[PDB]
Symmetry: C5
Subunit: 311 residues, 5 copies
């Protein structure tokens, strides 16, 4: 049939809950994550209320086709979720207790500015469009909101699974819509980042700095240029592990700065050679001697500045 009628003039309250069973396929590029969970729904339908000591027990079961069920959808899913109704139970008062198991690919924007020290809030937005007969409003039953303890996303610490109790009620295409924000909080657990990305990248840069204890222009050109190639090769090696964002990231700023340093090291190597060749070895020597301290110090300072700007 159609929606339940109101006692007075009130909207229908659909008590919702989401219990996370599985979390997988967090795609950093697509900004999507796959979820496998329970969706619990509860609402009052008077037309279904019954007498207990006349019925032979206290709670009866229905098929989805037999009764009216609210049309709940998710806002930020790519395709409609794959759902399987687990159970429908009517208490004597007429309260319906719906339960389904669903899997869905959820689109939630990600902010990689602080990579690999970034935290994310993954959203699952529940929605219900009000009907002509009556208005439908979503609510949160906190007893029904949780997550399985072994829920995992490799590379992340799963912080919390909560819901913003107060729904976002608004008008859309001339009709009322009640929205619910379910939040999955995750923070990045990237340990190997140091021995995998930073450390070998810094060793290559440090090798270039040995050109400050050499006067051989040929040896210096080989040091600075070949390390620059090794650095680029190393990025090609590590690119897989990085964000690929249209905005500047923290790790990306360090990498950019390392490119600047190779350029400055070339200028020095070039300058030192020109001065030597132009019979000014005292200046060439003082510049090289300064560079030995200037390069690490300016590097360390600029990194402190960067860290400060990002955090």
């Amino acid at each position: 049939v159609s929606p339940p009628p109101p006692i007075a003039d009130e909207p229908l309250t659909v008590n919702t809950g989401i219990y996370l069973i599985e979390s997988y396929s967090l795609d950093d590029c697509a900004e999507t994550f796959k979820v496998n969970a329970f969706l619990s729904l509860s609402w009052k339908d008077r037309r279904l209320a019954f007498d207990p000591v006349r019925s032979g027990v206290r709670v009866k079961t229905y098929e989805p086709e037999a009764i009216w069920i609210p049309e709940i959808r998710f806002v930020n899913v790519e395709n409609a979720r794959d759902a399987d109704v687990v159970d429908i139970s009517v208490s004597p008062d007429g309260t319906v207790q719906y339960l389904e198991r669903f899997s869905a690919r959820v689109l939630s924007p990600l902010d990689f500015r602080r990579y690999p020290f970034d935290s994310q809030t993954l959203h699952i937005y529940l929605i219900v469009r009000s009907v002509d007969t009556r208005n439908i409003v979503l609510a949160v039953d906190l007893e029904k909101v949780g997550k399985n303890d072994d829920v995992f996303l490799t590379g992340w610490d799963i912080e919390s699974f909560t819901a913003v109790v107060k729904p976002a009620n608004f008008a859309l295409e001339d009709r009322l819509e009640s929205k619910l924000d379910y939040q999955l909080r995750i923070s990045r657990q990237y340990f190997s980042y140091i021995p995998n990305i930073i450390l070998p990248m810094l060793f290559i840069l440090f090798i270039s700095w040995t050109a400050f204890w050499s006067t051989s222009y040929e040896a210096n050109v080989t040091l600075v240029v070949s390390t620059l190639i090794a650095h680029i090769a190393f990025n090609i090696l590590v690119e897989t592990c990085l964000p690929k964002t249209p905005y500047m990231t923290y790790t990306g700023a360090i990498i950019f700065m390392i490119y600047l340093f190779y350029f400055v090291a070339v200028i020095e190597v070039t300058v030192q050679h020109y001065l030597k060749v132009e019979s000014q070895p005292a200046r060439a020597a003082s510049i090289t001697r300064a560079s030995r301290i200037a390069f690490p110090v300016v590097f360390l300072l600029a990194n402190i500045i960067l860290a400060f700007l990002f955090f």
Copy 2:
């Protein structure tokens, strides 16, 4: 039943509207984008007209099987859309208000000539094939054409979501077809393009220009050729965030020009060495001294010419 009959001899007007809920998976290579939206349909079916007084209730709800619904399809979709009828509402005059939520992978050609300063117009073409009994014509209800504020496509600014009100009515396979052009305007927001692509690429090129302050042929060969390798290695690194195109792009033209510059720098390095070896060091020195200014100037000029040609 079959389509509603005409009052006179007029075609049936189906008032359409698309409201963008989500936009995702813009594939630059496939020239496709995924969309999750509402499709609203409106027409008049006199056969469904009712007396609100005798019926008591002012709007009646129907199941898709119960009434006639026009067969609306999308022209530029890979497979048929995944749709879910949200609501069907009938008013006393026989006005039908249809609403469905659909997801679809839309094929729309992209023009990368101005990358990364390119703008795109994504198309969603609505179509209806006329029946034997009467002709069907599409129309645009602008109240029903919009987009959710949260609608995002990482790397792009979502400009507008509009529809070309005037349908494209034409004959096909001996029947009338009424087409509607819905347009999603996007412009690229690639800030990080400068520190990610251009700047490190220019530093490598600038390093090869240091061969103009050196007389060592061995050091110069290492500078020019090793930077050329570094440049190629760098492009392999950035390959991913450059579009694969059968036509010349703006970024592609800069990159091609940088390859030409490495070739010219080799010629110079070669020429300077030959002259020195052929006991003409005055010419060798004047060419190298000129190159120091010629190379940056000719580069800067050619880039101005390129920018002008593309914009």
Copy 3:
């Protein structure tokens, strides 16, 4: 029900037509292409004959389950097509006019020997298996064979969409099968192939040829070997663009020849050094001087020979 009965002993003619709505996902590696088109079918089933006067209607509309429809399949599809019956129209003589919109991934062999100056004929084979009751034969209604003007395949010029009118009638597993060849002719458009693949590849090779104006064995080893690395790096860069083939392609023959040239250039560099070292500088000088003309000339000649062999 079962198939329509013959007036005499004649086969049933199914008039077919394919109208290309869209063409996408041409996979050069898989030798597959995706298509979205109309399939029109027309046959006479007298059992459906009606009196327009008695029925009140001039044309009767049926559901696919209501009437007999020939089992048309495609030979060269990955999985069965995704079809959506648009319309079934019966005229009083019993002529059925069927129309469906379908999407399918078609397997059609590709010949890359002339890449990037290759043209392809993409096939879509329609088939019908005859029944015991009567033989079924396919036919082409040319009024119903076409393609939308907007039909595109990035990197190709869509030449024509035609059908070989004469069906291929043959026996298979003790029954008659009537086959139809629909052909989509495409020719490659790769304007950017010259500035993207050939030109930078030729510049690298030309850099190696500068070793013919040098006597420094160390500088020459660096020129030849570093260019060889740059060439390999460049090919890894263009890998994607080139097709992966178990046969020799035109572009592939050029690339192979460029590898041979690097080897010959090494031999020269090696020979010139040995002669100089073995106190024969007059020969070393004459070989190097010859190489300056020999290398470009032999290269240009071998390319003319290759072009001739392939075209």
Copy 4:
């Protein structure tokens, strides 16, 4: 109908059994694997009991819709399994022998710390949610738990397929849930890892150690830096064989250590040159002479330490 009623107040026991037909698509990155297996279910339903003599038959076959079947689901699947009921058989007492063939993509966490000498325990968790009328409990029929001998996962030795007989009975969303742990034990068989990964990687490192029999700073810089590039290039080559891991792996630790060794070799090469240049050739020579033994010994020592820490 609804669930079978209890004789007393006992829960319903569903005897389960999974027989592995095929194992494929072990995705090291996704931490998923695909499975094709039989799912056997057994329970007693008194309502189905029959006298074989009066009925004439020893066994009765039913359609899934005809009888009550428990709702068994898998916990750690991406989407619901693709199942096909093979057979349903009832014995005179009301015992039901259910059998289905299913395929499913299973999510099971993987531990790469000991790669390539790692072993994995793959989990397939069976679950049943209890109903209002009676509690449902899962059990293991070991006669029905097995695997086809042909079962393979390229690169692994399939050790065992077993089930933890004792179910995990617990409460969830106000109802009892009975869980079963099916375990597939696999151990990696990567022999080709030595000639494919380690040996060529060690040869490159050993080439860098030849700088200890050279006094040419230019030759030494080329040896150390060019091998460092070759090492990075080699890792890019083998990157596909190694997994993306947020934790340090054994192979990962060796690779990190090899990066440290290239850095130390640079320091030595740099130190030896500075001492020579600073007119201390006796120290330079003694350091280089020590390095010849120090480098292999410290390397061999640190690898023994690493192996010990990981095993």
Copy 5:
């Protein structure tokens, strides 16, 4: 209804036949191959027998739901086949002639030890589980086993499509199962392997051998190490068209040997330099002179040993 009853105590014989329409998507990594074929089935069901005279025909057509059909499955498929019943024909004696068109992704292990001179036998295992009423046994109708002449797998010669007539009858989960082995024989046709992989790889190795006509340690270090980089770069280039295998392949053995040769060439270059430096130029010269013949000879010999050892 249920299965046909036996005349005497015999099992039911299901005559099978597979006719290959299309072969595509041979995935060397997944060890899977996609196939599009006809599956013909034939068995006797007396319940369906008729006198052609009284019943009004010779043969009659049934719907799959109307009659009993044996449950034939494939053992080595990832998911259940996509099948479409083409025809069901019952002859006067009750001989059922079933025909369906199916597509399936078939898992068949591959042996890359002889790559690219390998041959493969692709298996399609047909199976039937016996019922309580009677045992079911599979048989091969050779008239119904074939393949379309157009059947292709790019890079392979399709040798034969046959079936091992004698089924594999065995017990599983307390019931009889009858298995059939259908074999697709393919042999690799990788012509372009020589100019694409071997030849450029050998040229790089040969370039390293020029260090045997040089006394310049700096030039030699550049030759050996830069070619080693070029070799690795070339392997990254050919990575794609080489088997990723947990076992040693023929090509893999050649490639490993090439890595060993670069290491030995380094030792020589190192030895020759040390002897020269340690005032023993006569030995240095004799070693270098020997290596000129030793290297090609030992290489050519080891390749003959390998070839032999593998074929």
